[PDB]
Amino acid sequence: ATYAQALQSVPETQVSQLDNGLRVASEQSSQPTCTVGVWIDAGSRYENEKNNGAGYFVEHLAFKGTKNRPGSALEKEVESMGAHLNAYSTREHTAYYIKALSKDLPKAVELLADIVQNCSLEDSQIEKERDVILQELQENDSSMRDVVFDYLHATAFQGTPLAQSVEGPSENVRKLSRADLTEYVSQHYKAPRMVLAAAGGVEHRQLLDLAQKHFSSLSGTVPAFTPCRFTGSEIRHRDDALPLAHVAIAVEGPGWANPDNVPLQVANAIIGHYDSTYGGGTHMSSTLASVAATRKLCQSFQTFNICYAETGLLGAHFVCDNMSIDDMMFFLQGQWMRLCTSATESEVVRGKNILRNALVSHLDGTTPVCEDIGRSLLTYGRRIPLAEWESRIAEVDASVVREVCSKYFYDQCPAVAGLGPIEQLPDYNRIRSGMFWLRF
């Protein structure tokens, strides 16, 4: 039991492929509980200006009713056997997964096969779901973090489908005829862009049998996204009545490919995260976190590595009062250039340990394992074993971190998104000038 032995003791995720193109994957270890989910390659990145929000509407109507199971009866079958049904639709992925018992796996697939292929799309359900979506859009408007992230996506991927929000504009939600939903399901829920992931106590042979028996009727054997562009800009929503000032600044990072993710994820791990309710505070290793805790300069800050296929957003999002935005910008940018110019070996080792803990802690529990299987099959084209992750972490050193940070951070036009009392946010010229160090 020396980590490496444990890493090679993790059961592998066998992958099979039906004729239709559905990629079936399973990982049985011990558990009597399982998480089985269909991952679609659909999302807001694929919808055009008129179809924006169609994926959200389809996800909303997926569980309400099907063809074989009329309406609420579906929920009954989920509740009667104790299964928990859930769905999430990010910008480039969609997923419907149920957590059930190992015994209920033959049924677990069937309900899923009902949801993805033959939904109901009942007109009255659409009519009520329209109001539901409008109110949910209001709730998300109240969500200041989500609003800031959507603003960042809008101002970074300007003029591209990536800038489109997942929920879509409120004007679109009104029209959204049933024909549009049917067309979107037809040309975005095809078999090749499906991964049937199943974690927990599922046998891959049994999964293959059920998938073949329940998914063969799907389309067997074209807009396939386009490389988006980065437009370094900023959107400032000066709303002084808001209590805090949410700010997010990001740069063009790597994609799902481009192994530079591994070093950069280390560098972000060096910056770390911290909010008001934390532990050591001033004693934290991160210089930014220590300074913020010492001077009470923040109520929160986080480092994000949002990475899509062709590109992605790599940066930091912080929540602070109106009188600390400028100092925060200075300290965050200074930490970025400190990593770019002189990373040091000890900091890189700390980041490597933190990132090692991240993957293993995340890959705990049936649902996160199934989600990782689906996301890895869709994005990377394979489920990357934890041993390969360990090797990639090991290959990262101070020089590699310095080089990759200089490639992605040093002298780059950033995309900024502020919201709240953000009048003290430094002007974009000042922010960009902070992205190059005269001393170096």
Partner 1 sequence: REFGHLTRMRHVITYSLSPFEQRAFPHYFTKGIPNVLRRTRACILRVAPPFVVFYLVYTWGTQEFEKSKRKNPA
Ligand X SMILES: CCCCCCCCCCCCCCCCCC(=O)OC[C@H](COP(=O)([O-])OCC(O)COP(=O)([O-])OC[C@@H](COC(=O)CCCCCCCCCCCCCCCCC)OC(=O)CCCCCCCCCCCCCCCCC)OC(=O)CCCCCCCCCCCCCCCCC
Ligand Y SMILES: CCCCCCCCCCCCCCCCCC(=O)OC[C@H](COP(=O)(O)OCCN)OC(=O)CCCCCCCCCCCCCCCCC
Residues that bind ligand X (CB under 6 A): 330, 433-434, 437-439
Residues 367 and 195 sit within 8 Å (Cβ to Cβ)? no
Q: What are phi and psi of 151, to 5 degrees?
A: -60, -40
Binders of partner 1: how many residues, by CB under 8 A? 21
Tell me which residue of 402, 425, 413 sits closest to 330, measured CA to CA: 425
Enumerate residues 203-232 that contact partner 1 by CB under 8 A.
231-232
In angstroms, give the least distance from the CB of 405 to ligand Y: 17
Task: Show the tokens assigned to 105.
Answer: 């796996």
Nearest-angstrom CA–CA distance, 370 and 36: 7
In angstroms, give the least distance from the CB of 158 to partner 1: 9
Q: Is 439 in the site for ligand Y (CB under 6 A)?
A: no
Binders of ligand Y: how many residues, by CB under 6 A? 3
Binding mask 415-434 for ligand Y (x = CB under 6 A): ------------------xx
Tell me which residue of 371, 375, 355 sits closest to 363, measured CA to CA: 371
Q: Which of ligand X, partner 1, ligand Y, none does residue 439 bind to, with CB < 5 to 8 Å depending on kind?
A: ligand X
- Name the segment binding partner 1 (CB under 8 A); options: 34-42, 133-141, 173-181, 237-245: 237-245
> In the sheet that 14-17 helps form, which strands lie side by side, from edge to edge?
14-17, 23-26, 194-200, 33-40, 94-101, 84-89
Residues 263 and 400 sit within 8 Å (Cβ to Cβ)? yes
In angstroms, give the least distance from the CB of 430 to ligand X: 7
Q: Is 161 in the site for ligand Y (CB under 6 A)?
A: no
Q: Is 438 in the site for ligand Y (CB under 6 A)?
A: yes
Q: Which of partner 1, ligand X, ligand Y, none does residue 261 bind to, with CB < 5 to 8 Å depending on kind?
A: none
CB atoms within 10 A of CB 277: 7
Nearest-angstrom CA–CA distance, 250 and 254: 12
Enumerate residues 306-365 that contact partner 1 by CB under 8 A.
322-323, 326
Task: Name residue, tokens 């000038």.
Answer: 433
In angstroms, give the least distance from the CB of 440 to ligand X: 7
Helix (H) or strand (E) holding 373: helix 366-379
In angstroms, give the least distance from the CB of 230 to partner 1: 9
Q: Which is nearer to partner 1, 236 or 375 (CB)?
A: 236
Where in the sequence numbering do the catalytic residues fall?
59
Nearest-angstrom CA–CA distance, 405 and 338: 10
Burial call 110-123: b when 16+ CB within 10 Å, e when fewer:
bbbbbbbbebbbbe
Q: Is 432 in the site for partner 1 (CB under 8 A)?
A: yes
Candidate residues 365, 424, 436, 437; the one interacting with partner 1 per rule CB under 8 A:
424
SS3 for 342-372, per residue?
CCCHHHHHHHHHHHHHHHHHHCCCHHHHHHH
- In the beta sheet, which residues pair with residue 96? 38, 87
Q: Which of ligand X, partner 1, ligand Y, none does residue 236 bind to, with CB < 5 to 8 Å depending on kind?
A: partner 1
Q: Which is nearer to ligand X, 35 or 335 (CB)?
A: 335
Q: Which is nearer to partner 1, 103 or 238 (CB)?
A: 238
Q: Which is nearer to ligand Y, 312 or 434 (CB)?
A: 434
Candidate residues 244, 413, 436, 437; the one interacting with partner 1 per rule CB under 8 A:
413
- In the beta sheet, which residues pair with residue 39? 95, 195
Q: Which is nearer to partner 1, 144 or 191 (CB)?
A: 144
Residues contributing to the site for partner 1 (CB under 8 A): 155, 231-241, 322-323, 326, 413, 423-424, 428-429, 432
Residues contributing to the site for ligand Y (CB under 6 A): 433-434, 438
